[PDB]
Design a binder for this molecule. Structure first.
Ligand SMILES: CC(=O)Nc1ncc(CN2CC[C@]3(CCN(c4cc(C)n5ccnc5n4)C3)C2)s1
Ligand SMILES: CC(=O)Nc1ncc(CN2CC[C@]3(CCN(c4cc(C)n5ccnc5n4)C3)C2)s1
Ligand SMILES: [Ca+2]
Lengths: 449, 430
């Protein structure tokens, strides 16, 4: 029945504003979820200066957040990361962590996340005589925190190895997780991101193996909708790659979403749908999300709104970490097939259809882009402005190339790029690296043989 | 001569404090102008017919006063070109000009970049309404060589514009392209001929609104000082991120002032001036000058990587002419070691940036630095695998060494189809 479900503010970049946190909490509550975790990397007291307690203002914002979540039938957690230059056995360090916990506890914030995701290269020297491993040291420090709470509230532990790859493939083969699962107090839940930091799929056999080594069902920390790893990307598609059959194997489900608060309407809608609806299907879920989301696209000067089909296009373009949207996938795939020859036949309906859909894609992106400039909510506009520009430019250049092939140029003729494509397109440091570190169609890396 | 910056890019407009910081830098660099024209202001372009409310006009006069205090002039942009009937609309434009004029803002930019005799007449009307007070600068529809068709003297538009626009009105020009790699003396002499006046340069060399992936912290390059006799003004349209533009403004002011201007020497002087902004929070440190220099080298120019970064990658390319580099070859060993050192230095820079006092400067470069770090790390993982001397049939174990999320998405899918070879030619993989 009951289970921790919701969002972690846990990404690398600027933290959300008070109003953005309120909007997101609204969306969490509307989606049937019950948790907000405060842990933005931008907060100095979480990680960088973990020894230093909050001043009155910092603590007041936290209690306000707890109250705001409470009013929506939600729980609120506060993160700490005492892992940067911690001596796990040291009195002053243990006491300094206890003071942090005491402050939060005396202010009524007894729901804590302890993070241990970034440590030094070997065990500290003053700790080697007390503890036999990082796992045992972290476990003891966390158990101290749990015991200070006196059976009230809840502790969730982020491990150093929090995915399959970090644990070495099969999590049951990790020395770290073996010692962690046996040493961390049974009352403390453990985060897990699946086989990777950003998991393409989270499957039942994986989670069963994780539960074995951890000695408890994991709380999922899903990075499926996270975009902090790529400046070029945002994820407005549905949650995918997790069957509902995995949910019996977890103790919780927290999602670490896009940096841009306004980008997360579909992430929250569809993740809530996944957790609630036994018939969850990503393409049906995104349709329901798009219908709910569409009134946010009202136009500023007159009685219009961006059409549902163009909002749907927005999600298709900006879909998922390991898939383009169904429309965009098929358009590009059709073009690839038609481009197996150096000169496609302009009379061939395969080519003609592929080109026409590409042209139509261009016209629709243009329509969407123009209408986005006209919406009332400028935060939503600026969320997608640059991502939309990028897509528009790419599609335009592909259209100009395919249009030139549609004239049936001779085999020796070369595409007149100087007249058709801007000089500034596809340049810089990342392109220079990608020119050396090539990747072929089957996914294999090479440097041009 | 008009010298300074235009706020004229596509994206979010600057905050009051960011505009203040930028004006400080303009003044410190020996320049004298700030142009207000952000695409985010509805009254500039989208709803050009609608006058400012009291608050909107008050922010503008505040900006003019803030420029004045620094010995600077302030301009306000208008773009009556979207759905204008040039002969109709005239009164609505006159009202906009009257408001600004009655509030003491008589320095105007008229933009006609998205649609000659019609535009000229409309602009002359605005000039005549000002009654000989203040100044009008005109942004033409064809504002670069490419738009004019190569030689600007062959443009029917510019020919008619140059003869019809009032002589008191100056004209913007971006060089041979929107973002010019080079602006040369013969080009600007031809521009001056067709326009019938020396152009005011609007330089987009430091602009980054065209690419989500890019920011330009290197020196101004590709313009000789021998071009400056051929211009009436020099305005730069810089990076979206205000804190990114310290080197852009420093080096552009150096270019306009210093007869011995040389980009690599100028960036050293910029880095030395910029370094105290990188003071560390709680403690007496700052990010080392050499790591701030690395920041500019990584994030250099629109048409060049920095000199250090260029040489590191070039050395690696040469060493990778074979399918299996010899781990005993000093060419390979040197290239790999410098790559490793590049990685270590980026890491050092990145870590130290997380610790600086100025959080706006941190968040300016946070994402760009991550991106560079990730790319370098993956290249190192690949080159490290080659350094073990794998057999010719063996394939790089990417799944264990490179993150599953790396180099994916819609733009990568398009680029996979629309390929480009080493000589710059487009194709679709034969
Ligand atoms: C327990 C856990 O899963 N915790 C997470 N925390 C943040 C998360 C979301 N992303 C997903 C992939 C990854 C791995 C490293 N990474 C970084 C790291 C830095 C320093 N920057 C800076 C700018 N962009 C960055 N990206 C991207 C973290 S998941
Ligand atoms: C007269 C003049 O020089 N005027 C300019 N004004 C802005 C400028 C700076 N950039 C340089 C290259 C370029 C060409 C178009 N462009 C766009 C256009 C749009 C709509 N978006 C949206 C998001 N990103 C965009 N980028 C990038 C404009 S130059
Ligand atoms: Ca990247």
């Amino acid at each position: 029945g009951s289970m921790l479900t919701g969002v972690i503010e846990g990404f690398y970049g600027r933290d959300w504003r008070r109003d953005e946190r309120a909007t997101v909490m609204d969306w969490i509550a509307a989606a049937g979820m019950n948790t907000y975790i405060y842990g933005p990397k931008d907060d100095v007291h979480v990680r960088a200066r973990w020894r230093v307690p909050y001043d009155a203002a910092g603590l007041a914002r936290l209690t306000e957040l707890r109250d705001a979540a409470a009013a929506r039938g939600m729980v609120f957690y506060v993160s700490l990361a005492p892992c940067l230059d911690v001596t796990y056995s040291d009195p002053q360090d243990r006491a300094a962590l206890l003071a942090r916990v005491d402050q939060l506890a005396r202010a009524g914030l007894r729901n804590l996340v302890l993070l241990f995701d970034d440590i030094p290269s070997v065990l500290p020297e003053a700790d080697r005589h007390r503890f036999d491993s990082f796992a045992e040291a972290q476990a003891d420090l966390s158990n101290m925190v749990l015991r200070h709470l006196r059976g009230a509230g809840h502790v969730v532990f982020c491990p150093t190895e929090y995915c399959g790859r970090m644990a070495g493939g099969d999590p049951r083969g990790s020395a770290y997780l073996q010692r962690l699962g046996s040493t961390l107090d049974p009352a403390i839940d453990i985060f897990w991101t699946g086989p990777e930091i950003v998991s393409e799929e989270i499957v039942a056999a994986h989670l069963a193996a994780v539960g074995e080594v951890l000695r408890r069902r994991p709380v999922i920390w899903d990075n499926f909708h996270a975009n902090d790893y790529d400046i070029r990307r945002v994820f407005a598609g549905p949650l995918g790659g997790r069957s509902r059959d995995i949910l019996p194997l977890v103790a919780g489900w927290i999602t670490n979403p896009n940096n841009e608060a306004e980008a997360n309407f579909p992430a929250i809608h569809t993740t809530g749908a996944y957790l609630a609806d036994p018939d969850y299907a990503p393409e049906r879920a995104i349709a329901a999300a798009v219908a709910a989301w569409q009134p946010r696209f009202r136009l500023a000067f007159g009685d219009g709104a961006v059409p549902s089909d163009l909002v749907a296009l927005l999600c298709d373009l900006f879909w998922q970490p390991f898939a383009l949207g169904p429309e965009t996938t098929r358009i590009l795939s059709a073009l690839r097939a038609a481009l197996t020859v150096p000169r496609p036949d302009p009379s061939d309906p395969a080519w003609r259809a592929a080109l026409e859909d590409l042209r139509d894609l261009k016209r629709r992106i243009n329509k969407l882009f123009t209408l986005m400039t006209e919406i009332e909510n400028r935060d939503l506009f600026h969320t997608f402005h640059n991502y939309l520009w990028e897509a528009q430019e790419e599609v335009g250049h592909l259209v100009a190339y395919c249009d030139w092939l549609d004239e049936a140029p001779p085999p020796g003729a070369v595409f007149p790029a100087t007249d058709r494509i801007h000089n500034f397109y596809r340049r810089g440091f990342g392109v220079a690296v990608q020119d050396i570190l090539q990747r072929d169609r089957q996914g294999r890396y090479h440097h041009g043989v």
